[PDB]
Amino acid sequence: LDLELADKSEIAQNLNERRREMDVLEQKLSEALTELPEQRDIEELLAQINDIGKKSGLELSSVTPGKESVGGGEFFARIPIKMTVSGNYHEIALFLQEMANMRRIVNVNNIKFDSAKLKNEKVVLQSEFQATTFRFV
Amino acid sequence: IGKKSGLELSSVTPGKESVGGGEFFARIPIKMTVSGNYHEIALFLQEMANM
Amino acid sequence: TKARIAELEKIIGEVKNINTRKAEVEKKLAVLDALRKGRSGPVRMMDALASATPKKVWVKTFSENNNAVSIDGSAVSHDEVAEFMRGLNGVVWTPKGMGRLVDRRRDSKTARVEMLTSDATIEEFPEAQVSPFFKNIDLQTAKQVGGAQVGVPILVEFKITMTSNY
Amino acid sequence: VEMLTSDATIEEFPEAQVSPFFKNIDLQTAKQVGGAQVGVPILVEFKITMTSNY
Amino acid sequence: VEMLTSDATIEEFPEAQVSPFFKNIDLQTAKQVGGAQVGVPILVEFKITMTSNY
Amino acid sequence: CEEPPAPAPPPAKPKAAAAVPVKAAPTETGAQAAPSYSYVYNPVGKRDPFRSPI
């Protein structure tokens, strides 16, 4: 009994170290197929996107999920998320680099931004970044 | 230290860790944005440099 | 005993199923990050020249007026356009004046890449600076152009206007 | 084909972009035309206006 | 060096002083210029305007 | 039942005991990342432009 209780803590810690890194690379390339819940990892992704947006000073004008890419992989359905935040160039580079330093699976790819003021009377950059996570099939 | 120097802290913005800024350390930069008098900003700086 | 030992054979079955897939992932990905450089390549910088010195495969149009230059360009990502924009200046611009050159850009009558925002007349306040010789007004625009099945650029098209010094 | 909305003069602000050479103003309209017992199209009729670059 | 703010005409009230001969209006601007891979300055570029005495 | 402690060998809770400590779970779960960081960047610049145009 008492040695098995040692094995349980050892392998639970090894599981945590997985999640910690196997997820992260599920952003880099992507990773396995899955055991995945990720049902318990998408709303936290939206929430943390909102948080890194707030601490970067950006107004999150719209976050829009996507459709899973049924033909975007045999071992994974990619869900893309299009984020729409406005502010300063320094602050949007900040927002992007923070999402690219996150512990979750938000691989940012195609980026855009432009000056949101018609007449151009004050500096302001509306920014739309595309960033996706890879659930299983 | 910004408040006791009399400065209005208009924005504090963290950075990204510098993944290639060292083998033994990730540097996180913080960009601070405070407004006031020259004496007060020299004060703010010297206080942060004495922290 | 026989309960939790089974628990542990399962949890370690996971940990191994885990550990073997990770090493194929790091590798497949490192391939992927070589390939993204292999699609930025044919568009970006080192890849047509003839000594790897800039500007190279590069930035597009240059047009001056002996007070400001209104350039038109393309960079690798949110990074090299950030390196380039940092190397110049960063400004809070305010009361912009509209002039007949803007409409000549809307008219297409002055030949340029109307991916670009317009303008070249305003009043500037410094936010950040790096070149004491350059007052960049702002990264006027930037759009990552992906391409199609006929070919890539994938890079970030952009436009900047900057009054130098002197 | 007066399935189509009209117009070709306005002022445009970019939302998303893919061709650095093309400024599409908007998908001006789109209507899936089904057809009848005499025959199909079933496709989505549409109209777009776009100022190029140059 | 249009790193510099402009101007040279105003009305001044003393805050602190050290030279009885100099009335500096203000450190009009200051920006630490870092340089590039071709070379450094790293120093703090600045601009001041000052009416002397006499 | 089992008493305050049980009887004395201790009884039996080396086996109940040991193949407990604990449930285990084991909760093979909730790890944390260092992530990893990329490196920057290749130049020295070249001149054509901009020496003549300023």
From TrEMBL, chain B:
It comes from the Bacteria. This is PilO. It comes from Myxococcus xanthus (strain DK1622). The gene is pilO. The chain holds residues 104 to 154 of 205 of the full protein.
UniProtKB/TrEMBL annotation, chain C:
It comes from the Bacteria. Keywords: Membrane, Transmembrane, Transmembrane helix. One of its GO terms (biological process) is type IV pilus assembly. Signal peptide: none annotated. This is PilN. The gene is pilN.
UniProtKB/TrEMBL annotation, chain F:
It comes from the Bacteria. Residues 4-13 have a biased composition (Pro residues). Residues 1-32 are annotated as: Disordered. Signal peptide: none annotated. Residues 14-26 have a biased composition (Low complexity). This is PilP. The chain holds residues 5 to 58 of 172 of the full protein.
